[PDB]
Amino acid sequence: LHKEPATLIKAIDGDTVKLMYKGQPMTFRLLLVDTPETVEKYGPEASAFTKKMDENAKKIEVEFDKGQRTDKYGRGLAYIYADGKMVNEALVRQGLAKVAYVYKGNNTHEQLLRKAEAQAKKEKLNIWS
Ligand SMILES: Cc1cn([C@H]2C[C@H](OP(=O)(O)O)[C@@H](COP(=O)(O)O)O2)c(=O)[nH]c1=O
Numbered sequence: 064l065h066k067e068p069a070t071l072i073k074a075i076d077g078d079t080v081k082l083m084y085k086g087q088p089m090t091f092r093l094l095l096v097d098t099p100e101t102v103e104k105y106g107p108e109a110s111a112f113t114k115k116m117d118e119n120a121k122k123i124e125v126e127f128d129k130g131q132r133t134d135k136y137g138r139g140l141a142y143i144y145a146d147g148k149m150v151n152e153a154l155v156r157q158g159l160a161k162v163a164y165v166y167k168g169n170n171t172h173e174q175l176l177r178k179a180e181a182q183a184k185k186e187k188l189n190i191w192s
Contacts, residue, residue, distance in 0.1 A: 066124040074117060078109070079093070082123065090139070093142070094164075098113070098159060117143070121146050124147075125142075127139075140167075149172070155176050159190065161190065
């Protein structure tokens with residue numbers, strides 16, 4: 064697995080972001096996470112979190128997993144990093160997303176995310192409150 068450079072184009076919601084990747088604009092769906100739909104409880108919160116984390120980043124990186132790189136809707140499936148920090152992981156650690164959708168052999172960071180979820184649950188953060 065390797066991180067690749069990308070440019071923030073526009074926020075979409077908690078687990079989806081529009082990024083310029085290799086000179087082409089595309090929507091990226093964050094791997095292994097499920098944020099509330101924007102409405103569901105904490106949906107706006109999750110959206111604001113991702114939007115802020117991504118926009119404040121000096122450097123945005125995309126990291127594809129070992130399996131399929133795009134879903135049926137043409138969205139890139141990856142782990143997004145903002146200044147070295149994984150957005151997927153931070154959302155789950157903040158209790159603003161649950162671990163979900165383990166598909167197409169893309170589960171490299173599943174355990175790391177499961178640990179963040181357990182901690183957020185233990186702390187009764189947001190979704191787990
Ligand atoms: C995270 C992820 C979602 N998806 C699909 C499953 C869902 O399809 P359906 O439309 O059948 O529900 C959809 C959920 O995306 P959102 O959570 O953005 O709605 O994206 C994948 O196929 N692979 C993945 O790795």
